[PDB]
Short mmCIF file of C-alpha atoms and ligand atoms in Angstrom, two decimals:
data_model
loop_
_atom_site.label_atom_id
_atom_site.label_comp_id
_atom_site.label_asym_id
_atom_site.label_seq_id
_atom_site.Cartn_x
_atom_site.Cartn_y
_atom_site.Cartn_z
CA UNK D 1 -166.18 -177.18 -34.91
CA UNK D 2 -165.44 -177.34 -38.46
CA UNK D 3 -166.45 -180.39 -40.97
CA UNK D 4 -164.71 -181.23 -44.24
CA UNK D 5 -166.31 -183.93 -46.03
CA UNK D 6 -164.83 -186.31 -48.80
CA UNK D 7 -165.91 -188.16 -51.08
CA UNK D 8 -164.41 -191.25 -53.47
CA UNK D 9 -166.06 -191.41 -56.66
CA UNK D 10 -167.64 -195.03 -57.77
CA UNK D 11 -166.92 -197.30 -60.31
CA UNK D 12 -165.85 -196.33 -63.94
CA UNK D 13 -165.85 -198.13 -66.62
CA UNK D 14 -162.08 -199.68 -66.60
CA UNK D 15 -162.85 -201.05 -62.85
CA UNK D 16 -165.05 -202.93 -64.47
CA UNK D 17 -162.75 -204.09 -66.97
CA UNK D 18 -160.17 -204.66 -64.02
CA UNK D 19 -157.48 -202.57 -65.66
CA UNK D 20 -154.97 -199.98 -63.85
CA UNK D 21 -156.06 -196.53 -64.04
CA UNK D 22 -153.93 -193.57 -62.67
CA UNK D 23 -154.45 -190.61 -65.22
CA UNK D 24 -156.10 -192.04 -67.60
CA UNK D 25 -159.66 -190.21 -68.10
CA UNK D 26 -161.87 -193.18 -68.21
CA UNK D 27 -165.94 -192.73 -67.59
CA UNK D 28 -168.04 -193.14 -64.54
CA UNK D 29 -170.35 -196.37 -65.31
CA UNK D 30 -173.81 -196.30 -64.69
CA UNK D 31 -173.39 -198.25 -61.44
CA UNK D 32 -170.83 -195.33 -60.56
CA UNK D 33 -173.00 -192.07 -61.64
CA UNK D 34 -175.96 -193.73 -59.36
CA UNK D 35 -173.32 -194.18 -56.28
CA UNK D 36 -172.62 -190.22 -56.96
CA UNK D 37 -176.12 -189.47 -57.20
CA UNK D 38 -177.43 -191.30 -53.89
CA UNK D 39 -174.15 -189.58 -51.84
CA UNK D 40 -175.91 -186.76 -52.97
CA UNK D 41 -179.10 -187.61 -51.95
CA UNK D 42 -177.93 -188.56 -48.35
CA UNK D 43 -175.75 -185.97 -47.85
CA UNK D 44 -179.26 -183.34 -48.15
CA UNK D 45 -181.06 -185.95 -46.12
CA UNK D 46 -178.41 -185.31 -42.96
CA UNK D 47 -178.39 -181.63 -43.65
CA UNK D 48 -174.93 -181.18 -45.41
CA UNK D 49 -174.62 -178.00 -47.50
CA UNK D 50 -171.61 -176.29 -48.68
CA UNK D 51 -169.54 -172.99 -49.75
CA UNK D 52 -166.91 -174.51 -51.97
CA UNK D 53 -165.33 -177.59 -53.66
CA UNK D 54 -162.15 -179.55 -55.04
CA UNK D 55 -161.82 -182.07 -57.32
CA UNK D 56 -159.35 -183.52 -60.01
CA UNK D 57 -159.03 -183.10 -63.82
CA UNK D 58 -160.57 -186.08 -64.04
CA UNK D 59 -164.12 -186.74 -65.26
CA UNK D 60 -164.74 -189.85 -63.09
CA UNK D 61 -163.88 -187.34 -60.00
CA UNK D 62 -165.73 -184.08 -61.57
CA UNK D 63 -169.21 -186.10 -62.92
CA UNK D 64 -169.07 -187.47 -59.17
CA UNK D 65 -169.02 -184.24 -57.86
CA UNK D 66 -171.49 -182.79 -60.28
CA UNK D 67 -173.91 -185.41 -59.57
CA UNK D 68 -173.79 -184.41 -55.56
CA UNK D 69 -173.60 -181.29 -56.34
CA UNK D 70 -177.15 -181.05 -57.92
CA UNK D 71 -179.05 -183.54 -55.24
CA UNK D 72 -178.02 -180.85 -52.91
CA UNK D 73 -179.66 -177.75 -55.28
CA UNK D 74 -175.96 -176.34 -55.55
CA UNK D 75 -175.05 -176.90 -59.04
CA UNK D 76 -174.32 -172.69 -58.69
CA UNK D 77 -171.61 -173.84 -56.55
CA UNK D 78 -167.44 -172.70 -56.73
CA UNK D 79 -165.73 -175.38 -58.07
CA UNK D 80 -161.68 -175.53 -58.62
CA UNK D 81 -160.26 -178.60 -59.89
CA UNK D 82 -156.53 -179.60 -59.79
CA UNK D 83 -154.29 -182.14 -60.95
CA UNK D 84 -152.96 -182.05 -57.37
CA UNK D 85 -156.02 -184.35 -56.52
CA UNK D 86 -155.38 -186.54 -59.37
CA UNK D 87 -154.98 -190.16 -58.73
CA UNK D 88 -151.55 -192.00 -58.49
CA UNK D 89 -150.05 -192.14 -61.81
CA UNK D 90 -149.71 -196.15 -62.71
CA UNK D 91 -146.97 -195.56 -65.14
CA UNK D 92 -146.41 -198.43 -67.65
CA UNK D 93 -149.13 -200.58 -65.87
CA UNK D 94 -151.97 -197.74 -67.48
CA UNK D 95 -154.14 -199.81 -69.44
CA UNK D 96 -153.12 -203.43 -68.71
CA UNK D 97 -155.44 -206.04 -67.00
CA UNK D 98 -154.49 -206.70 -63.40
CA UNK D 99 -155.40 -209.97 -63.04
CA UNK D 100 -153.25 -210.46 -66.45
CA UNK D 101 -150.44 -208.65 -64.65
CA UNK D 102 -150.53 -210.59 -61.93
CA UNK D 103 -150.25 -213.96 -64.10
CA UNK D 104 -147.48 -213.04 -66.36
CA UNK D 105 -145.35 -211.08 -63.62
CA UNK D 106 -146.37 -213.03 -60.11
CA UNK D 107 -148.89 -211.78 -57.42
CA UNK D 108 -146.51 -210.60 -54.92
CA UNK D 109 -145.02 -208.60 -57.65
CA UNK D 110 -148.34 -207.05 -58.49
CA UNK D 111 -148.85 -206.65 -54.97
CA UNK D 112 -145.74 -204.37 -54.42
CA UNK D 113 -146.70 -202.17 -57.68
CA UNK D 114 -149.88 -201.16 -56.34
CA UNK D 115 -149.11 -201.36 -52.01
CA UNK D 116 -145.10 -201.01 -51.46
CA UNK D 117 -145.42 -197.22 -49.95
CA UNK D 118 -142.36 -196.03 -51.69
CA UNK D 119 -142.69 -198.70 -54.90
CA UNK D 120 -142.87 -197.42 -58.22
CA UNK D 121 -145.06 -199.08 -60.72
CA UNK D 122 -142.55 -199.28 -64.61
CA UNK D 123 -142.34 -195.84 -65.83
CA UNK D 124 -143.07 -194.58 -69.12
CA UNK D 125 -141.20 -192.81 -71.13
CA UNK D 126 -142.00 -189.68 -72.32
CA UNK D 127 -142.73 -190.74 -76.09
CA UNK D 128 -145.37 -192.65 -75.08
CA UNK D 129 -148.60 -191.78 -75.84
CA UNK D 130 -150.20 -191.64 -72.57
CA UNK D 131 -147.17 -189.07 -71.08
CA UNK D 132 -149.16 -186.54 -69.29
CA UNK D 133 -147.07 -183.79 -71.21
CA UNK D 134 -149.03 -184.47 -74.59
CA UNK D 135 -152.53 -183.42 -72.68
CA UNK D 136 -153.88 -180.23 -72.98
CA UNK D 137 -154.87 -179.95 -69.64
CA UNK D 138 -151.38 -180.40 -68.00
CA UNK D 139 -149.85 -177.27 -70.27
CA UNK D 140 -148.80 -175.58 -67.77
CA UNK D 141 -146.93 -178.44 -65.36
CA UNK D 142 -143.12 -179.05 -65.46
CA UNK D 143 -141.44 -181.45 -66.68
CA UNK D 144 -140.90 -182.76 -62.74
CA UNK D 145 -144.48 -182.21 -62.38
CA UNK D 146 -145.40 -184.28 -65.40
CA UNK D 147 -145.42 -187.70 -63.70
CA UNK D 148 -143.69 -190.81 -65.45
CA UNK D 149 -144.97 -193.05 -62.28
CA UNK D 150 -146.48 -192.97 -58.52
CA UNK D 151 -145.85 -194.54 -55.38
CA UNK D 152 -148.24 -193.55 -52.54
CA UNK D 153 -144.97 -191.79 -51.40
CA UNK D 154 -144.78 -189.60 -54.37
CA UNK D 155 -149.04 -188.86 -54.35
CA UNK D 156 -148.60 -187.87 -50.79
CA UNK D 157 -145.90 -184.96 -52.09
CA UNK D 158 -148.10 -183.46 -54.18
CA UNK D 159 -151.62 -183.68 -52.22
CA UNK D 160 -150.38 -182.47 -49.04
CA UNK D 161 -149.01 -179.48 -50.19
CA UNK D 162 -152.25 -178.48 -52.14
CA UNK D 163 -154.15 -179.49 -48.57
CA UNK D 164 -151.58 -177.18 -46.61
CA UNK D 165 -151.24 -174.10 -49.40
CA UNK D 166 -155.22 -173.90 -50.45
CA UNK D 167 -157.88 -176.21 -49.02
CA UNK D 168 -157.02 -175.71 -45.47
CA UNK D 169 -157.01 -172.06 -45.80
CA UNK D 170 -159.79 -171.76 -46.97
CA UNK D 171 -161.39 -173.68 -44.42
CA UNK D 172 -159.82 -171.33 -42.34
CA UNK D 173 -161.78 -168.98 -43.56
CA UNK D 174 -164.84 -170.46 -42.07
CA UNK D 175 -166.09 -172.12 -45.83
CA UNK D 176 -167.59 -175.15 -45.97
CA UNK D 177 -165.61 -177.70 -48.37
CA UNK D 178 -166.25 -180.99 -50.30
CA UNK D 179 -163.26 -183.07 -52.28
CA UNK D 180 -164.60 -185.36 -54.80
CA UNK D 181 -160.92 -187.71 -55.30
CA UNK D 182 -159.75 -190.71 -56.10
CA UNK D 183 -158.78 -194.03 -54.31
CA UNK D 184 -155.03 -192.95 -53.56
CA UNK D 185 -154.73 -188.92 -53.68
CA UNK D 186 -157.86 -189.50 -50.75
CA UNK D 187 -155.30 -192.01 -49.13
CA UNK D 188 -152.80 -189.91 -49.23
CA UNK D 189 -154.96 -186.97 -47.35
CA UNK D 190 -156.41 -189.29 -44.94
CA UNK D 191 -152.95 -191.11 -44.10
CA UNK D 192 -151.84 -187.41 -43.19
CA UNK D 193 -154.63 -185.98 -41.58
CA UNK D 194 -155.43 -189.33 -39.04
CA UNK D 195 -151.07 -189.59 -38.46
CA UNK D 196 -150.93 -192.89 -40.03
CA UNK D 197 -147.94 -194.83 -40.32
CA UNK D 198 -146.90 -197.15 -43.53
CA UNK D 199 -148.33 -200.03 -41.99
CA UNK D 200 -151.22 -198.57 -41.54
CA UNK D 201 -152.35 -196.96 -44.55
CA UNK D 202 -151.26 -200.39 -46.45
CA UNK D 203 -154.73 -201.72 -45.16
CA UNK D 204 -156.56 -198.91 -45.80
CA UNK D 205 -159.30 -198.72 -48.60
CA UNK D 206 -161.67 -196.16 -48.68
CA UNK D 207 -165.22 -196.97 -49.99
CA UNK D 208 -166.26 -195.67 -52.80
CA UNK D 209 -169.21 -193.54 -52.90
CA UNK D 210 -169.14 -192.86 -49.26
CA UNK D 211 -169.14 -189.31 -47.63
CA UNK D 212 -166.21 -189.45 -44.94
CA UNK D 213 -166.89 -186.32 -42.37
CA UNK D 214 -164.23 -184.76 -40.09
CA UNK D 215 -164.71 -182.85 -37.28
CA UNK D 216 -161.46 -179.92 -36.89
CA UNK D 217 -161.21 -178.36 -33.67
CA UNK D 218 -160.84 -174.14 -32.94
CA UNK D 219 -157.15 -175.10 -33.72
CA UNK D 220 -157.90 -177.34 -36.86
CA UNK D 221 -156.44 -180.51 -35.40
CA UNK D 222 -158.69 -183.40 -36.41
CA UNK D 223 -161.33 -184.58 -33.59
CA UNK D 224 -163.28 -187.00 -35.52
CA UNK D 225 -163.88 -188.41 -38.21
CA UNK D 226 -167.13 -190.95 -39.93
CA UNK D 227 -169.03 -192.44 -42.77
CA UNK D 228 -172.59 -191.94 -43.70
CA UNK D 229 -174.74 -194.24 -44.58
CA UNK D 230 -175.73 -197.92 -43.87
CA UNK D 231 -172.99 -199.53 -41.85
CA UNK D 232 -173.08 -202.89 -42.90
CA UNK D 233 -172.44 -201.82 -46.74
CA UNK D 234 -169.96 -199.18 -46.15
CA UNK D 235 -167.97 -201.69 -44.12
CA UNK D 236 -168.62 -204.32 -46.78
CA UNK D 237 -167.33 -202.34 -49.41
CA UNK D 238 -164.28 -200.51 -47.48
CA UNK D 239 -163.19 -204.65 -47.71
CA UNK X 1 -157.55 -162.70 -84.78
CA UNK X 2 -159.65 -164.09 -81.05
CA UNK X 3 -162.83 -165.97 -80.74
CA UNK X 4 -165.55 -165.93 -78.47
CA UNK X 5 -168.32 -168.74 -78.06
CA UNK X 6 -171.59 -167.53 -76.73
CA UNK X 7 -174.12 -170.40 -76.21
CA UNK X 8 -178.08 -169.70 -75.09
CA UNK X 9 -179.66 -172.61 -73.32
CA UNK X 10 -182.42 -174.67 -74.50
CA UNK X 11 -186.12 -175.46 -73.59
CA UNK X 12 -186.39 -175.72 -69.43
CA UNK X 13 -189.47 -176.75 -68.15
CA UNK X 14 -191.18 -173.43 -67.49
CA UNK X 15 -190.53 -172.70 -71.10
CA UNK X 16 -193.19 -176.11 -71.47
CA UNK X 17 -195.32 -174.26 -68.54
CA UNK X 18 -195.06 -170.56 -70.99
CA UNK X 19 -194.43 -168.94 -67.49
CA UNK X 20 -192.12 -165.90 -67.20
CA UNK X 21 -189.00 -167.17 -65.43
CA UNK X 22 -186.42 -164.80 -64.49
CA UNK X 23 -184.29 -165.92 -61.57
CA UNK X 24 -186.31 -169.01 -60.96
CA UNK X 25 -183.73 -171.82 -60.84
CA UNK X 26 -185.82 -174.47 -63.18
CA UNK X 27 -184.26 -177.17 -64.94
CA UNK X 28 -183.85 -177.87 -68.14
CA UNK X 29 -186.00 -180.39 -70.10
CA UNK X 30 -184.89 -183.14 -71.68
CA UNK X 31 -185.13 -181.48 -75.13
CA UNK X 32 -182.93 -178.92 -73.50
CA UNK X 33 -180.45 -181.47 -72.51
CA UNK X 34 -180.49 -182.67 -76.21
CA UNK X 35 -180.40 -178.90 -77.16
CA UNK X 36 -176.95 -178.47 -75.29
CA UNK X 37 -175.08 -181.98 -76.07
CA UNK X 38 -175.69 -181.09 -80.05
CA UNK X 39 -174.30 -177.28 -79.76
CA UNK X 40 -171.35 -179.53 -77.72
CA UNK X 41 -170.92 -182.03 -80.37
CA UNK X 42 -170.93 -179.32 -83.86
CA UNK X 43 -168.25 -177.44 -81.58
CA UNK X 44 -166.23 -180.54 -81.31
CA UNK X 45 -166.73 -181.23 -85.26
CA UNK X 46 -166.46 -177.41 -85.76
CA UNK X 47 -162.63 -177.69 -84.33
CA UNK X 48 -163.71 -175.41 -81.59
CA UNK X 49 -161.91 -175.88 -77.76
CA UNK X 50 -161.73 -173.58 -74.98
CA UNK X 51 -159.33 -172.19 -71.79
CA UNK X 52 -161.95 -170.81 -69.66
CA UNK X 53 -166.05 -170.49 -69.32
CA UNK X 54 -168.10 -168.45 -67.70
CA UNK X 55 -172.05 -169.14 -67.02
CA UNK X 56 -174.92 -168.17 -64.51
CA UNK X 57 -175.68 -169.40 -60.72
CA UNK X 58 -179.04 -170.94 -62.64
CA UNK X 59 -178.60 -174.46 -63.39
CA UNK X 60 -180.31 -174.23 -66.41
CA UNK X 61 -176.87 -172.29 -67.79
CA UNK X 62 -174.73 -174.54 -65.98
CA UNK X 63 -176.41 -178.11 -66.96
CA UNK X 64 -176.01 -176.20 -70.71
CA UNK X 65 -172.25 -175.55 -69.99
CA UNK X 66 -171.58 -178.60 -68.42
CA UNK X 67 -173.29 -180.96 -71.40
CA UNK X 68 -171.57 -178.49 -73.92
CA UNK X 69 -167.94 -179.36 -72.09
CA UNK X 70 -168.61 -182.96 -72.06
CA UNK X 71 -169.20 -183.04 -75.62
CA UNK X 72 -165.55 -181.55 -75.93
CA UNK X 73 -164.06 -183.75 -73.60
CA UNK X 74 -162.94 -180.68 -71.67
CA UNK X 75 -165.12 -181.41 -68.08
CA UNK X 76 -161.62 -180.25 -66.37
CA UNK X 77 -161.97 -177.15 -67.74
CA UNK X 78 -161.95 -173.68 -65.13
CA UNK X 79 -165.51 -172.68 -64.73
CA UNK X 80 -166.80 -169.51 -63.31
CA UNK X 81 -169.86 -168.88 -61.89
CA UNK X 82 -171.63 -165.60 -61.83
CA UNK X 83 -175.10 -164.26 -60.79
CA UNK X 84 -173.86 -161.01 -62.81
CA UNK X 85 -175.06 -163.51 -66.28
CA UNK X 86 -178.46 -164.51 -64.79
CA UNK X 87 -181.50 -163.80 -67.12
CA UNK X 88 -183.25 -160.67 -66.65
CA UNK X 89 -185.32 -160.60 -63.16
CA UNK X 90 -189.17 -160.45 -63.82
CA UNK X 91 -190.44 -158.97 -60.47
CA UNK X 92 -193.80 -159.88 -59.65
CA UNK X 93 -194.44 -161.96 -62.92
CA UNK X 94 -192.18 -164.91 -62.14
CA UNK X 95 -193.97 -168.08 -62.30
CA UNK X 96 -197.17 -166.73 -64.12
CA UNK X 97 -198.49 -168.09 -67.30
CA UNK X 98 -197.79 -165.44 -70.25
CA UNK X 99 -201.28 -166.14 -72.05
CA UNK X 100 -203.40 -166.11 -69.10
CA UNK X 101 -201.27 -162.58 -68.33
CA UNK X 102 -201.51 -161.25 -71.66
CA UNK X 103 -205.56 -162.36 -71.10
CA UNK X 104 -206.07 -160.72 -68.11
CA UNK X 105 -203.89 -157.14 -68.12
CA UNK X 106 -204.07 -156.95 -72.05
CA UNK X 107 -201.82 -157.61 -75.00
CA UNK X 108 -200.01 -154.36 -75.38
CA UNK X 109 -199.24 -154.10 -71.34
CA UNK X 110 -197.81 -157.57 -71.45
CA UNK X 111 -195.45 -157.15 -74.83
CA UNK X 112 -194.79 -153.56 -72.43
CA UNK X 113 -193.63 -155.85 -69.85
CA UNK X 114 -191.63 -158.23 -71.93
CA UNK X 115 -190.03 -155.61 -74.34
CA UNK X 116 -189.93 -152.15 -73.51
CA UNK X 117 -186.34 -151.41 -73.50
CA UNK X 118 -186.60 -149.75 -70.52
CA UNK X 119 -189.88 -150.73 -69.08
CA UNK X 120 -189.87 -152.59 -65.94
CA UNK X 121 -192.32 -155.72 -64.77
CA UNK X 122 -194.46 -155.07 -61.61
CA UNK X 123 -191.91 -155.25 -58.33
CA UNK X 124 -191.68 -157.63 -56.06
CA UNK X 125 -191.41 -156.98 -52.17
CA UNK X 126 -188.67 -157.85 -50.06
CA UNK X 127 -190.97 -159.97 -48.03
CA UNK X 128 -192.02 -162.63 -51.27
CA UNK X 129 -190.67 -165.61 -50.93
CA UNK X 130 -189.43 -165.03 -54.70
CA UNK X 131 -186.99 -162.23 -53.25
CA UNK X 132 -183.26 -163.14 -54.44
CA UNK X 133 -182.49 -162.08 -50.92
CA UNK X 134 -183.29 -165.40 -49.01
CA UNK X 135 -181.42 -167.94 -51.46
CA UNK X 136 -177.73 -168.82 -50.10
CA UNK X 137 -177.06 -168.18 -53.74
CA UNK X 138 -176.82 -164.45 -53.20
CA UNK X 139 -175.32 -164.29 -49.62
CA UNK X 140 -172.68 -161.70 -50.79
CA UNK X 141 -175.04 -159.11 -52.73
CA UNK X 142 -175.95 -155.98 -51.37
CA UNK X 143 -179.76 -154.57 -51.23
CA UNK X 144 -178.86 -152.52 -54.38
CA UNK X 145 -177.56 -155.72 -56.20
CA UNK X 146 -180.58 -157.90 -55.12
CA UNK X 147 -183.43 -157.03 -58.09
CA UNK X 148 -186.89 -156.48 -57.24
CA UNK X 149 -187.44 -156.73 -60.89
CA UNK X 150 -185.43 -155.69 -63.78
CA UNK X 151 -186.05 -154.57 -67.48
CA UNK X 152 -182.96 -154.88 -70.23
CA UNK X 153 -181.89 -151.74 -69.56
CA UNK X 154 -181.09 -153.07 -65.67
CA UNK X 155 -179.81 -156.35 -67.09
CA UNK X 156 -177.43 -154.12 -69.54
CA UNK X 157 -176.51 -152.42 -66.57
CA UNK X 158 -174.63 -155.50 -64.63
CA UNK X 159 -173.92 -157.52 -67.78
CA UNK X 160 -171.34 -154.97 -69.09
CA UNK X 161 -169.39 -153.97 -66.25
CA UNK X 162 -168.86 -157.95 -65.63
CA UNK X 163 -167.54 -158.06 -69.66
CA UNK X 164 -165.29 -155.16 -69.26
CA UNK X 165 -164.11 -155.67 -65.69
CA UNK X 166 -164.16 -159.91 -65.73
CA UNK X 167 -164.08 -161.72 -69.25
CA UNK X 168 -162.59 -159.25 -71.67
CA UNK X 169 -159.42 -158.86 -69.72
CA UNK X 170 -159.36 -162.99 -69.99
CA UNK X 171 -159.69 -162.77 -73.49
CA UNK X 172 -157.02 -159.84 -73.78
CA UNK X 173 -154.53 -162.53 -71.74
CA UNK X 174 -154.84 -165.14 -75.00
CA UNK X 175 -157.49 -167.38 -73.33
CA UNK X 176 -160.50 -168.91 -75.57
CA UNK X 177 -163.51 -168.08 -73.66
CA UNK X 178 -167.19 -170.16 -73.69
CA UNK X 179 -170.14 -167.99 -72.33
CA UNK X 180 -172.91 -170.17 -71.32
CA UNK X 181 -176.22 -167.63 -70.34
CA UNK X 182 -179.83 -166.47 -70.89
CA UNK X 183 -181.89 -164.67 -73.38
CA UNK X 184 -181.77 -161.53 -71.98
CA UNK X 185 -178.09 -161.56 -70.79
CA UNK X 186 -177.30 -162.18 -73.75
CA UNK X 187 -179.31 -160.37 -75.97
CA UNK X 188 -177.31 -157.10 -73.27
CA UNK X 189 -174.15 -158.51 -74.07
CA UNK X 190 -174.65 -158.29 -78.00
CA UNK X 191 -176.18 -154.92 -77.97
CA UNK X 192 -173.22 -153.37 -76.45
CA UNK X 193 -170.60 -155.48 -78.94
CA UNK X 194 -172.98 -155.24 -81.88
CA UNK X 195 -173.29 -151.32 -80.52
CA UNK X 196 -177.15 -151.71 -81.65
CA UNK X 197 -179.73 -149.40 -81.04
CA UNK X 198 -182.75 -149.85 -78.53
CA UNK X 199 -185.33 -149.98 -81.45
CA UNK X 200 -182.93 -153.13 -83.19
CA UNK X 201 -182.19 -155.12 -79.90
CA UNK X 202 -186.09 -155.24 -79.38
CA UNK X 203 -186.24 -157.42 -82.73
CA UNK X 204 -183.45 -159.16 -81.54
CA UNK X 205 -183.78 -163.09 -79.88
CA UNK X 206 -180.81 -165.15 -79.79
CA UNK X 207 -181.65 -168.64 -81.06
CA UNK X 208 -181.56 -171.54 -78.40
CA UNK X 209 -178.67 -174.07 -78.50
CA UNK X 210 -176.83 -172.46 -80.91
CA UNK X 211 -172.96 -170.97 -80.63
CA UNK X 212 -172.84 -167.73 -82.25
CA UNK X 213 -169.16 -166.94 -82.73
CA UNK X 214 -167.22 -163.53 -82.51
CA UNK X 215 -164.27 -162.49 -84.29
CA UNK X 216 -162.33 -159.95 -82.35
CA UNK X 217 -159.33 -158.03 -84.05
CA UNK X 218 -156.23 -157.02 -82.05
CA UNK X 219 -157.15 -153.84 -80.82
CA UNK X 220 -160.47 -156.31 -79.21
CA UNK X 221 -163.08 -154.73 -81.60
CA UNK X 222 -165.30 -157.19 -83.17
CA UNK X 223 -164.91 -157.75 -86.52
CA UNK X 224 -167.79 -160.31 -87.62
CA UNK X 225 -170.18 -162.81 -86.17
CA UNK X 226 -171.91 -165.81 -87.67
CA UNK X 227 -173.89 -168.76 -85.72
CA UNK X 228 -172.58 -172.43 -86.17
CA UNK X 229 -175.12 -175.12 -87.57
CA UNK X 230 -177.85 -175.49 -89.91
CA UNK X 231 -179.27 -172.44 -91.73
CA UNK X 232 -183.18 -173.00 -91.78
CA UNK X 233 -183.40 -174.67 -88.51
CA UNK X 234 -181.34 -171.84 -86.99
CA UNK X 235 -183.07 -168.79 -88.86
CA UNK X 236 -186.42 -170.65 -87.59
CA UNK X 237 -185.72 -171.01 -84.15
CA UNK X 238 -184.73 -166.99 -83.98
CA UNK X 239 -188.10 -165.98 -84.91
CL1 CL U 1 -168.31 -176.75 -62.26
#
């Protein structure tokens, strides 16, 4: 039996401001960098250790991971981080206040931006200053890699095939792998990975700050899968 | 006309303690947190940014790299990790106090230890508990790679190979390299590209917290080098 275990980082600083994320690179807050620190801390305490991990380009996702990464005396560990683990793109809605959103545009609107599987938040265009293309860190993407928006749909086309062409491979390869992501790229892996349907991954909010383990058979088919921690505020929080 | 960053990191706690370190993993202290998020910050104001960085398996390099990329808002940035840029071992001596040493084998054996090009500290056995040989770290070295003690001449003799066989073809491929490391892996890596002399590198410390820069022409031979930052604090600290 092989374990996996993922992790969502905690809250940044524009959760707290209630604004749509996607790409943009906005800071762990304090609240968040302790979350990261006491996954850490737990994860030693059960007797997790690891050979490699994944992350995103983005600093909420990599200070998570660098936060576990030194509760568990590993700071000298491998580390590759992708875009393909970003979060969903939010297109136009990058920036803007959701609750705002909600009153100038309706709730059930909002509600199919950020939930319709296949809906596509407004896109930018590719003047606009927060077009991945004017980043340095997305030099070498295509223009049909450069998102303008993200559904869940379109998140799940690019995780999945980063899953299936590296990470699983290299758990193949009998390593032992972390992935410090985001709300809807770890979503996305979990909707695949537990054969979810739309209606089910709709519901489906994974708590931040939480280690998720699986369990993958001789075969790598998924056996298992759990939180750590206390129940009562993982299951609070996964609300 | 290609740069190179190098970067030595600051004051770690054993530093405090005056012990001989070596490949004891100690942390920084917080003046060598401060140490690393200035050298960050005059890169940033410098104009400085980078494609790739190497460091250590010794968090004391890493929390130095990792402050250093904050500072330039490059966290996303491809980070390798290799034991081949640890500070020189120091055998037996690792975790002794250098006065009490110096008091109780004599001056002239200790500066022996510390500085004779060639010279190597008192040996460990495989059996210590200080052997490189039981930390996960080093899982894929062989007996000959694990040290029982090294001088520079050792160090010199697994820095280089990793600059010719690892970084300098990165640099050769147009990418801006940061080198995050010790005193003695460093002080290796600018013998060879200073080509210095054993009688100048043993003058030679590299100050802490400081980028020293290298000009390389386009055949890759170094044309000048020159640290970044205030003159007489600089020129101090490299006493
Ligand atoms: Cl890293």
């Amino acid at each position: 039996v092989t374990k996996l275990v993922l992790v969502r980082h905690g809250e940044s600083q524009w959760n707290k401001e209630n604004r749509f994320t996607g790409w943009y690179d906005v800071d762990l807050s304090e609240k968040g960098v302790s979350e990261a620190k006491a996954a850490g801390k737990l994860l030693k305490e059960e007797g997790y250790s690891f050979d490699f991990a994944y992350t995103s380009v983005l600093k909420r996702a990599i200070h998570t991971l660098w936060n576990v990464l030194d509760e568990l005396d590993q700071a000298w560990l491998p580390v590759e981080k992708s875009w393909k683990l970003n979060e969903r793109h939010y297109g136009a809605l990058q920036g803007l206040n959701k609750a705002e959103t909600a009153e100038k545009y309706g709730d059930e609107q909002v509600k199919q931006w950020r939930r319709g599987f296949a809906v596509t938040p407004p896109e930018l265009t590719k003047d606009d200053e927060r077009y991945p293309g004017h980043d340095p860190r997305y030099a070498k993407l295509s223009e049909k890699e450069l998102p303008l928006t993200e559904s869940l749909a379109l998140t799940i086309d690019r995780v999945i095939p980063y899953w299936n062409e590296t990470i699983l491979p290299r758990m193949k390869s009998g390593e032992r792998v972390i992935i410090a992501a985001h709300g809807n790229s770890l979503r996305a892996l979990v909707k695949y990975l537990d054969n979810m349907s739309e209606e089910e991954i709709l519901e489906l909010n994974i708590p931040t700050g939480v280690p998720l383990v699986y369990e993958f058979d001789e075969n790598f088919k998924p056996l298992k899968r759990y939180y750590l921690g206390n129940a009562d505020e993982i299951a609070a929080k996964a609300a």
